[PDB]
Amino acid sequence: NLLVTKRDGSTERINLDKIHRVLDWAAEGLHNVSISQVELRSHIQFYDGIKTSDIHETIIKAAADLISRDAPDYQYLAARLAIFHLRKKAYGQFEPPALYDHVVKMVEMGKYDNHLLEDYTEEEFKQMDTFIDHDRDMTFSYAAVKQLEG
Amino acid sequence: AYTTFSQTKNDQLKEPMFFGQPVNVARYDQQKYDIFEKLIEKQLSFFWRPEEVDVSRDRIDYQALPEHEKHIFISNLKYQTLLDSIQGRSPNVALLPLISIPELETWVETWAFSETIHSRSYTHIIRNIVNDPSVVFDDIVTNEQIQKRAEGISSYYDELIEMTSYWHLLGEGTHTVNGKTVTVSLRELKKKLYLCLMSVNALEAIRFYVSFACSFAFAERELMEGNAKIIRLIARDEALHLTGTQHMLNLLRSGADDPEMAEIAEECKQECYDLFVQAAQQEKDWADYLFRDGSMIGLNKDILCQYVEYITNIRMQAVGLDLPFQTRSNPIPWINTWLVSQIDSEVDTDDLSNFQL
Amino acid sequence: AYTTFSQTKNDQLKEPMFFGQPVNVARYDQQKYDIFEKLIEKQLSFFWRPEEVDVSRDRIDYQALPEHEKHIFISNLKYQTLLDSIQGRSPNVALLPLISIPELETWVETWAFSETIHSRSYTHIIRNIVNDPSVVFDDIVTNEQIQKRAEGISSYYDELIEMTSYWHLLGEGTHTVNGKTVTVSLRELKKKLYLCLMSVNALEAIRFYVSFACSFAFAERELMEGNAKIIRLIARDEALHLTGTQHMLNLLRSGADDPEMAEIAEECKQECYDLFVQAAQQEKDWADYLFRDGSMIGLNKDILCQYVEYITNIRMQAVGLDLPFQTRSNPIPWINTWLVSQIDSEVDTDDLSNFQL
Ligand SMILES: Nc1ncnc2c1ncn2[C@H]1C[C@H](O)[C@@H](COP(=O)(O)OP(=O)(O)OP(=O)(O)O)O1
Ligand SMILES: Nc1ncnc2c1ncn2[C@H]1C[C@H](O)[C@@H](COP(=O)(O)OP(=O)(O)OP(=O)(O)O)O1
Ligand SMILES: [Mg+2]
Numbered sequence: 001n002l003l004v005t006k007r008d009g010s011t012e013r014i015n016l017d018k019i020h021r022v023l024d025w026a027a028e029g030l031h032n033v034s035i036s037q038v039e040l041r042s043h044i045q046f047y048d049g050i051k052t053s054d055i056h057e058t059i060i061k062a063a064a065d066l067i068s069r070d071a072p073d074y075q076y077l078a079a080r081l082a083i084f085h086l087r088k089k090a091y092g093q094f095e096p097p098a099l100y101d102h103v104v105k106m107v108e109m110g111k112y113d114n115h116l117l118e119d120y121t122e123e124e125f126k127q128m129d130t131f132i133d134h135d136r137d138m139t140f141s142y143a144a145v146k147q148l149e150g
Numbered sequence: 151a152y153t154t155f156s157q158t159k160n161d162q163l164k165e166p167m168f169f170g171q172p173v174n175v176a177r178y179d180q181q182k183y184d185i186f187e188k189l190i191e192k193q194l195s196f197f198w199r200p201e202e203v204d205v206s207r208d209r210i211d212y213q214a215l216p217e218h219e220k221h222i223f224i225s226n227l228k229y230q231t232l233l234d235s236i237q238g239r240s241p242n243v244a245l246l247p248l249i250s251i252p253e254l255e256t257w258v259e260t261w262a263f264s265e266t267i268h269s270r271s272y273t274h275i276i277r278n279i280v281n282d283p284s285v286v287f288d289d290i291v292t293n294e295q296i297q298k299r300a301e302g303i304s305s306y307y308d309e310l311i312e313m314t315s316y317w318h319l320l321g322e323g324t325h326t327v328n329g330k331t332v333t334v335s336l337r338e339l340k341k342k343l344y345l346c347l348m349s350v351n352a353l354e355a356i357r358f359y360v361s362f363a364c365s366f367a368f369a370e371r372e373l374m375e376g377n378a379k380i381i382r383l384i385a386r387d388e389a390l391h392l393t394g395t396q397h398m399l400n401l402l403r404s405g406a407d408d409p410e411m412a413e414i415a416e417e418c419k420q421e422c423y424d425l426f427v428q429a430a431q432q433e434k435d436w437a438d439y440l441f442r443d444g445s446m447i448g449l450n451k452d453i454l455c456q457y458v459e460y461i462t463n464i465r466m467q468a469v470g471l472d473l474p475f476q477t478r479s480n481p482i483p484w485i486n487t488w489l490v491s492q493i494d495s496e497v498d499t500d501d502l503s504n505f506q507l
Numbered sequence: 508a509y510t511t512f513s514q515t516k517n518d519q520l521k522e523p524m525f526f527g528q529p530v531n532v533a534r535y536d537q538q539k540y541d542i543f544e545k546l547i548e549k550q551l552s553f554f555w556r557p558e559e560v561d562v563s564r565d566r567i568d569y570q571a572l573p574e575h576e577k578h579i580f581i582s583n584l585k586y587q588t589l590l591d592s593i594q595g596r597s598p599n600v601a602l603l604p605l606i607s608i609p610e611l612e613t614w615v616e617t618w619a620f621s622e623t624i625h626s627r628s629y630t631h632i633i634r635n636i637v638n639d640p641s642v643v644f645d646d647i648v649t650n651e652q653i654q655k656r657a658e659g660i661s662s663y664y665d666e667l668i669e670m671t672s673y674w675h676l677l678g679e680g681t682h683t684v685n686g687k688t689v690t691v692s693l694r695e696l697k698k699k700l701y702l703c704l705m706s707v708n709a710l711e712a713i714r715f716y717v718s719f720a721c722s723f724a725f726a727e728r729e730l731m732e733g734n735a736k737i738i739r740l741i742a743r744d745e746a747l748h749l750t751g752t753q754h755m756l757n758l759l760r761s762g763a764d765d766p767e768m769a770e771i772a773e774e775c776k777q778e779c780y781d782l783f784v785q786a787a788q789q790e791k792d793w794a795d796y797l798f799r800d801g802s803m804i805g806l807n808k809d810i811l812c813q814y815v816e817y818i819t820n821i822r823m824q825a826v827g828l829d830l831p832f833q834t835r836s837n838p839i840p841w842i843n844t845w846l847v848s849q850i851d852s853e854v855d856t857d858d859l860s861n862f863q864l
Contacts, residue, residue: 016445020452032479039372040448040484152668154597155589155661159648168776175647176592176626179633217858232512235533239612242599242619256623259599263620266613268531270547276536283536290532291516304512311509311604315672320684328682357757495608 002048004055007088014046023059026080029037038063038077056085062140078142087148096134100125152247152318162251167398168343169336170250177252185397186257192439193260193390198383200271205278205376212279212374218443227276227439228290228366232300233357234268234384235290240307241265257394258476264387270460271380278376295439299357299432306349310342311408340414347399347421348469355392355465356458359489360433362388363457364440366488367449368485378488385489392465397398419471426475427474430462456481509675518599523765525700526693527607534609542754543614546605550617550747555740557628562635562733566815569636569731577803580731582797583721584633585647589657590714591625598622601703604671611755618751621744628737635733652796656789663706667699683776695773701759704752705826709786712749712822713815713856716742716846717790720814721797723845724806735845742846749822756826776828784831787819805839813838
């Protein structure tokens with residue numbers, strides 16, 4: 001009967017199936033990992049109004065510390081969980097925006113260099129968006145992803 | 151005819167495990183198969199009482215559980231009470247009249263006794279988490295999801311006890327009992343024993359360990375920890391129990407004890423395989439019932455069903471049966487923690503001088 | 508037909524001790540007769556192991572004994588091994604299919620289990636005083652002076668086990684089994700149960716206590732004290748055991764549990780009297796064999812036979828049987844210690860003046 005606080009501020013009833021779905025996705029294709037281990041090692045302390053973004057960061061830490069010689073594939077489970085969390089932090093969703101739409105907003109915010117818009121045209125930016133393979137974020141290890149966001 | 155003290159002086163070391171001369175003198179200075187003497191010594195060393203465990207804090211944890219998790223916990227407790235209720239009396243009733251070596255006789259009696267401690271501890275746990283224990287106990291016999299497997303498990307025991315009575319009352323041969331013809335085959339009795347032990351092995355090595363997953367999954371959340379200490383003690387005995395049945399089954403299957411038995415064990419291989427597969431399917435269905443109203447952190451239908459397939463392959467391999475499920479890594483690795491216990495500053499310039507930069 | 512888990516949901520508090528519905532669920536939150544629940548709790552608290560007792564000094568004392576005292580000790584030990592060999596398996600085999608309330612079922616298995624500890628302690632003592640235990644054990648079955656008394660006790664068990672199998676396989680009624688007619692009477696089965704419990708009561712409360720006198724007579728002379736330490740623990744259990752059979756017998760005899768049984772108990776009253784009297788004569792006969800080659804300080808044929816008659820009157824009176832021997836004071840009172848745990852210088856001249864010499 002308790003409520004979790006979603007990323008957009010709204011709330012809904014706590015559903016552990018949401019957590020099972022995320023972990024089953026992150027453990028897909030991996031060998032010798034355990035959804036149950038990640039949930040139990042999280043020691044996640046629920047309370048009414050718990051932020052859903054803090055919940056996810058907990059299971060990333062838990063899966064990251066399970067990296068061992070006997071279970072080396074946790075380096076990919078924790079990485080896939082970390083990429084997922086990092087997509088939401090920057091975009092609010094999973095799919096990244098277009099390369100042009102992003103550079104426009106970022107140069108406008110002063111976070112990117114001004115020359116990106118001057119030296120490349122929108123037709124050129126869309127052509128490089130076809131080069132991008134956003135599925136290559138699924139080939140990182142957890143140590144790589146933490147150095148990326150860090 | 152069974153006798154509590156057989157008059158014949160038999161060399162107990164040459165008797166078989168079953169169907170030989172009834173044990174007369176109970177001596178423990180020598181053994182034919184010393185595996186059972188070790189099981190006795192180890193079970194006697196594990197002696198524990200339920201009251202010596204603090205379970206008072208568990209009531210707080212139980213009442214704070216979600217409504218469907220009270221059900222998950224209390225259903226696994228009703229099922230546990232039923233299995234170890236059967237296991238309290240059955241090895242004594244079903245095996246003692248057949249045993250013919252003293253070490254196996256005494257082990258079965260120690261095995262059975264240790265099961266009554268489990269039954270007493272379930273009364274201990276129940277009396278400390280629920281308000282009216284009668285609510286839990288009265289549901290055990292009528293429960294639909296339980297009584298299906300309850301009557302199936304007890305049947306292997308009941309049938310072995312019945313054939314044993316005919317074999318003792320009438321002996322081997324074709325008999326007539328009130329008109330109807332009754333055939334008493336020792337080979338058919340040896341077949342009902344082997345099937346029973348197989349059913350008991352699946353009962354204690356698969357059915358209970360699926361239950362262990364439920365009890366210990368709550369403990370990984372630091373909930374029901376008084377229960378977890380008792381279930382941990384039970385799990386330590388349960389490892390001794392299934393080891394006993396494994397050695398019995400393998401000694402019968404390998405024909406070391408009875409040349410006839412090695413052949414009979416092969417005639418049952420398909421029936422025994424179906425026996426284990428049915429047990430594994432029954433527990434997966436039981437898992438489907440536990441999580442019908444929701445799951446919990448670390449355990450759902452998938453996780454528990456994966457452990458059913460995982461532990462079944464392990465148990466069936468130990469008794470020489472074909473693996474019915476795909477190879478799989480342990481889906482709940484956390485359960486294993488519950489089932490097993492300056493500068494040497496001296497310089498030598500001459501040695502350094504032997505150098506060319 | 509016996510079932511290890513009866514399908515009927517029955518109020519166990521209203522079932523009789525025996526011959527009711529076979530126990531299904533094993534619960535201990537309630538009892539019909541709480542005497543058996545207390546006996547379980549008390550037996551579990553007395554749990555001891557033989558190896559935790561120092562018996563190393565006993566080999567030296569034994570080898571230093573006179574030859575006829577070696578005979579007394581080792582004969583009383585062989586007889587002890589024989590009796591508790593029967594007692595290890597018999598309560599489990601003969602009573603478990605008949606019991607219909609859970610507290611009595613668990614007590615019988617606990618009772619039996621504690622007897623296997625006795626059987627193991629006899630092996631412990633034997634293996635630590637003699638050089639080849641095989642010589643001691645093999646003589647238990649072959650010695651004609653010993654095995655004679657074995658068949659008297661085992662018969663009451665064997666006959667109850669046989670009638671029980673017929674009552675389960677055929678049910679009550681007149682049957683024909685391979686031509687010959689076989690009548691199964693529940694009243695005759697209740698009669699074989701009551702007679703059996705009477706035989707066990709005389710075994711554990713008279714026969715063994717005669718043996719206790721021998722073990723403790725060596726201890727009063729500070730000899731075989733490691734044996735005496737174990738026998739004292741065994742006697743502490745034996746006091747619980749005979750209390751169980753007394754309570755069963757008295758509940759059956761008064762008809763509080765089963766009115767039909769009050770009738771049957773009266774039809775056996777003469778058989779029970781002769782049963783107890785015979786046991787005393789057999790133990791007096793056994794005493795003649797112990798001292799066939801001589802006596803020792805504090806114990807001879809006369810002394811031990813007086814204790815047989817002394818202890819028999821007490822036991823028979825406890826179950827409503829007539830006293831067969833003359834009244835006598837305890838001939839060995841030392842055994843009871845083993846079978847239980849400035850002058851006030853002030854003067855008043857005025858008071859003295861108020862005087863008349
Ligand atoms: N109802 C819920 N109760 C508990 N945990 C939840 C719930 N829904 C999602 N989670 C968990 C699963 C994820 O591992 C973690 C992050 O979820 P995520 O889907 O990124 O948050 P969200 O659903 O609030 O944002 P978005 O709108 O982007 O989906 O939160
Ligand atoms: N092809 C895929 N790529 C990435 N993630 C996937 C894919 N298929 C399934 N998933 C997983 C990732 C998420 O954990 C889950 C869906 O994420 P999300 O939109 O957050 O749903 P949710 O369970 O949080 O519901 P909601 O967001 O509506 O509350 O499914
Ligand atoms: Mg979401």
